[PDB]
């Protein structure tokens, strides 16, 4: 069916070849075509390399698909909906598993999707709010961050975090036009001081490096 | 200080946000150079190379010249202390400085520190430059690399790299870059050698 399909042409007017595969949303742009300006920047960008000439000939830009964000969000929704007969540590284990399963699958499409980052902020703070509601208060000072993020050994709950990052913002009009850059930093979830809470994304290793790593490791073992 | 820097890094999502978190902090301007040095150290300790730390130190250099001269001295330091690593650390620092070069953050003058004589070249430094120049060629492409390796305006520094006066290290260095697979520059310089006598 044409409505559930998607066809994308690359010619002398479209330099970008966009497609949508297993969960990713990719867009390939060669260097030959209209990239007078080229960068090498944040890992949302794979650098495809022409295997005979061994020169980098195009860049693939990745994003999370929209139905995958929706699937993550509905998953959190049923964590919350079926959690009134469970303990704080079970709710937080379900959150931990859902978030690990998303972050270790996508891993650099998450950096580049400014709609994920907001999804993750709201979803993590909904989990925290249900734990507060579990006690009989939601006062922001009865529950500093330390109460949630302390490991399960020191008696905390053990949450894993991705909601204390700053969300980059830039000038909606051109942001819907021409990929303008990043000028401002909206704030993520609220910590009791500077407090600099660590991040899951920094401990998971990007794909584009795992694939080079693997190539060399198995080559030299062979 | 190193605690706060490592934590600001390990709390951010990209080099822009981490540089912001550092500059929204404040410090006494004394350890500005040691600032970049620290990020240098951090990516040395890293899983594998991600140009994150490259990008962050490069943005600091972009922010002040203090870190540019810091980086001059830092490349001098790592060429002095290059054997002090393992090949893992060796390769990640190699792609460090390769990023620095093709980012235009480190200036191509730096090659003055590289005299490609067999007697003075660490095998460790040999591997260092091989990874460096593999990355340069496969990133900027061979045309503009060989073009930049060619123009005289930096040949004063390039002299230690391209041996013409003394013949034996010409043999050695042309053999080395050939092994790396830079046929063009190598055999041009060897044709100069053939014309020499």
């Amino acid at each position: 069916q044409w409505e559930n399909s998607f066809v994308s042409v690359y010619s002398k007017d479209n330099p970008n070849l966009l497609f949508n595969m297993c969960g990713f949303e990719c867009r390939i742009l060669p260097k030959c075509r209209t990239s007078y300006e080229e960068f090498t920047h944040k890992d949302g960008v794979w650098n495809l390399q022409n295997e005979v000439t061994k020169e980098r000939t195009a860049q693939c830009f990745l994003r999370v698909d929209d139905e995958s964000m929706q699937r993550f969000h509905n998953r959190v929704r049923q964590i919350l909906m079926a959690s009134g007969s469970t303990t704080f540590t079970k709710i937080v284990n379900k959150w931990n598993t859902a978030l690990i399963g998303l972050m270790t699958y996508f891993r650099e499409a998450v950096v580049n999707t400014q709609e994920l980052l907001d999804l993750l902020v709201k979803c993590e703070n909904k989990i925290q709010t249900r734990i507060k509601i579990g006690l009989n208060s939601k006062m922001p000072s009865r529950f500093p961050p330390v109460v949630f993020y302390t490991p399960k050994e020191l008696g905390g709950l053990g949450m894993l975090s991705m909601g204390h990052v700053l969300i980059p913002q830039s000038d909606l009009r051109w942001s819907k036009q021409t990929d303008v850059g990043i000028t401002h930093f909206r704030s993520g979830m609220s910590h009791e001081e500077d407090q600099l809470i660590p991040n899951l994304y920094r401990y998971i290793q990007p794909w584009e490096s795992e694939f080079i790593d693997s190539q060399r490791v198995w080559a030299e073992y062979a | 200080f190193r605690r706060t820097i490592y934590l600001a890094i390990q709390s951010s999502l990209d080099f822009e946000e981490c540089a912001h978190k550092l500059l929204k902090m404040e410090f006494p301007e004394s350890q500005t150079k040691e600032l970049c040095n620290m990020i240098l150290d951090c990516c040395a300790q890293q899983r594998t190379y991600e140009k994150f730390f490259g990008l962050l130190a490069g943005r600091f250099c972009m922010l002040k010249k203090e870190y540019m001269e810091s980086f001059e001295g830092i490349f001098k330091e790592q060429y002095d202390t290059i054997h002090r690593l393992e090949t893992n650390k060796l390769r990640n620092v190699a792609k460090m400085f390769a990023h620095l070069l093709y980012t235009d953050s480190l200036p191509w003058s730096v090659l003055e520190c590289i005299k490609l004589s067999e007697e003075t070249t660490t095998s460790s430094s040999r591997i260092f430059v091989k990874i460096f120049f593999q990355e340069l060629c496969e990133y900027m492409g061979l045309p503009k690399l060989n073009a930049r390796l060619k123009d005289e305006t930096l040949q004063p520094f390039f002299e230690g790299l391209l041996p013409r006066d003394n013949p034996r290290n010409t043999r050695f260095a042309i053999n080395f870059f050939t092994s790396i697979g830079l046929g063009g520059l190598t055999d041009e310089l060897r044709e100069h050698l053939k014309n020499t006598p």
Partner: peptide, 26 residues
């Protein structure tokens, strides 16, 4: 200056909606 940056309402968002300018912009 709400210069096309930020949220309409920081209300059900899990954030205080505080905006700032990228100090490492140059």
């Amino acid at each position: 200056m709400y210069n096309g940056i930020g949220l309409p309402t920081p209300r059900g968002s899990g954030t205080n909606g505080y905006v700032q300018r990228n100090l490492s912009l140059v």
